[PDB]
Design a protein around this ligand. Structure first.
Ligand SMILES: CC(=O)Nc1ccc(Nc2ccccc2)cc1
Ligand SMILES: [Cl-]
Ligand SMILES: [Zn+2]
Ligand SMILES: [Zn+2]
Length: 573
């Protein structure tokens, strides 16, 4: 307890001893309270909204721009059989993930390059992050903390809740130095992990699900856990910590301290309107950096789903206790079929798709519920609803269509309801956006639509309009998946590289010569997925699109523009 968190608590108190009140009205039940002390809406993208006028009267789009009691829950201890299944499975999984990879420290050099390239390091004397890393003063702060971690102690690694937990850059760097290798060296790639998809773009994911569908077995299951991060047990944190068993020297001690001090024993500051800063502490739940959180969520989800598969296949009879011969059976299953079973899955952090050996999986719920990974929007003991067609499975907020080109070649394309796509592109995060920076964010969305959602009539038209309205040489940006659309290269050349040249599922490498060779969904399928084709509002928009393009060009001013509309049949004279 305070033997590990006390110093951080003392430092904060001393910096506010002029306001330190132990409020007895404090709401926290499951978070430990220590004391208090005296102490960001969405903006509309005008370039995208002016070029999507028909959506101005669709509430599912317009209401997206307008505007915890789950974290203060507790997770019961799993049973002895459950804790044994998890320990055996976790030990085996870190060894498999580590067969072709070497754990290693990430460096000041690597960390500084990431900060000077703008990435959500989730950080809070110095203005921007770029100021700290260019100041030898900061690194002495990092050194002090670092030598403290080697000492087995922590002073400044404190979470700030807003459910994203920001930390100071120094604490982030240290986290990155010890555990960044998981992401930087692609431990959760489909190559290294078999069930992972780390570094797979949206253009990959449908082909991966179609490959899982080719396996013999039951339905495809895609059960979402309710508030996954709140359901991470101290047992899960212990099993994740076993990656340090694969490390040596300094690195091992440094990683052991991140897990011990900042993951298994957290200090958090939360804003309460009642304005008193509450310094609360808890040992369980996930609160790490987003990138580390993604890799460890993928790890613990892969472990949980292999255990659900073992339950369905009858590898163990009861979670209450594993017999000695059940342990050797579990071990032997992993060694014998573990890799083949990992391949029957697609796992992206807390999101999974599983094609088990058969449908006994649907009612194999005792380990899943006892690990605390309770399914969303279904009764605790009701059997899972499976999907019979890989094209109807949800994954990473998408579904996937099989689309046949006029020349016979097969595209597997990502898709989601079109209101969600338009509504997101109409939103910008942050202050001080110039008109040029707003235009370049609109161009980023347009180019993403050309590459990923070209098969949606409305998005190919709106993408071409936005690209026509923004000066041709202005570079797409985003302050906030492999992002092939972030480029000033011709989008037809990028489309060819992504969908033909580099696509391992396309045997014929004949390049496409024009956008007219690139197909759409069926007209009726496009409407099912939210297209406005067939409405009067949409027909007037499409017919008059040059007038909308010219409105935005007039606002931006005398610049160099390209007309992309004649790349579409209906504007080709
Ligand atoms: C390029 C292209 O195919 N555009 C297109 C196709 C059909 C409609 N209209 C419509 C749709 C579905 C059902 C009844 C009418 C409008 C535009
Ligand atoms: Cl189905
Ligand atoms: Zn620390
Ligand atoms: Zn669709």
């Amino acid at each position: 307890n305070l033997d590990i968190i006390g110093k951080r608590i003392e430092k904060i108190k001393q910096e506010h001893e002029t306001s330190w009140h132990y409020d007895q009205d404090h709401p926290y039940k499951t978070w430990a309270y220590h004391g208090s002390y005296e102490t960001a809406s969405s903006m509309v993208n005008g370039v995208v909204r002016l070029l999507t006028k028909p959506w101005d009267i669709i509430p599912m789009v317009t209401q997206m721009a307008m505007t915890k009691e789950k974290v203060d829950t507790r997770t019961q201890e799993p049973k002895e059989g459950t804790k044994k299944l998890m320990k055996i499975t976790a030990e085996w999984l870190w060894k498999e993930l580590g067969k072709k990879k070497t754990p290693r420290m990430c460096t000041r050099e690597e960390f500084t390059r990431k900060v000077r390239s703008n990435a959500a390091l989730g950080a809070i004397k110095w203005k921007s992050a770029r100021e700290a890393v260019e100041d030898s003063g900061f690194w002495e702060l990092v050194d002090k903390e670092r030598n403290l971690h080697l000492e087995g102690k922590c002073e400044t690694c404190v979470y700030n809740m807003m459910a994203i937990w920001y930390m100071w850059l120094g604490a982030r760097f240290l986290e990155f130095e010890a555990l960044g290798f998981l992401n930087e060296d692609h431990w959760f790639s489909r190559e290294n992990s078999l069930s992972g998809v780390e570094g797979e773009g949206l253009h990959k994911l449908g082909y991966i699900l179609r490959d899982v569908s080719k396996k013999e077995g039951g339905a495809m299951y895609a059960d979402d856990t309710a508030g996954w991060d709140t359901r991470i047990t101290l047992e899960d944190l212990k099993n994740e910590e076993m990656v340090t068993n694969h490390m040596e020297g300094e690195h091992k001690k440094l990683a052991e301290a991140i897990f011990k001090l900042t993951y298994q024993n957290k200090v958090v500051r939360v804003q309460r309107p009642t304005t008193v800063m509450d310094i609360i502490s808890r040992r369980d739940q996930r609160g790490s950096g987003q990138v580390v959180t993604y890799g460890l969520n993928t790890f613990t989800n892969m472990e949980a789903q292999l255990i659900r598969q073992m339950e369905g296949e009858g590898v163990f009879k009861s979670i209450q206790h594993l017999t000695v011969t059940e342990e050797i059976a579990v071990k032997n299953w992993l060694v014998r079929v573990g890799r083949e079973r990992l391949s029957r899955m697609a796992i992206s952090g807390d999101d999974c798709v599983v094609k088990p050996l058969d449908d006994r999986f649907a009612s194999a719920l005792t380990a899943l519920n006892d690990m605390g990974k309770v399914r969303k929007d279904i009764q605790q003991w009701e059997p899972s609803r499976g999907w019979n067609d890989w094209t109807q499975v949800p994954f990473c907020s998408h579904h996937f269509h099989e689309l046949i080109m006029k020349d016979g070649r097969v595209l597997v394309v990502p898709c989601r309801n079109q209101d969600e796509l338009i509504g997101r592109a109409r939103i910008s995060q942050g202050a001080g956006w110039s008109l040029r920076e707003t235009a370049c964010l609109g161009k980023s969305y347009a180019q993403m639509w050309s590459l990923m959602y070209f098969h949606r009539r409305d998005l190919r038209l709106a993408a071409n309009a936005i690209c026509s309205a923004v000066p041709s040489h202005w570079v797409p940006t985003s302050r906030t998946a492999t992002h092939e659309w972030m480029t000033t290269e011709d989008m037809l050349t990028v489309w060819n590289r992504v969908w033909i040249q580099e696509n391992p599922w396309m045997e014929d490498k004949t390049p496409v010569e024009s956008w007219e060779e690139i197909p759409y969904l069926g007209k009726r399928e496009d409407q099912w997925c939210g297209s406005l084709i067939g409405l009067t509002s949409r027909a007037t928009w499409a017919k008059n699109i040059q007038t909308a393009i010219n409105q935005v060009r007039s606002l931006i001013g005398n610049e160099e523009y390209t007309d992309y509309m004649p790349s579409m049949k209906r504007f080709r004279r």
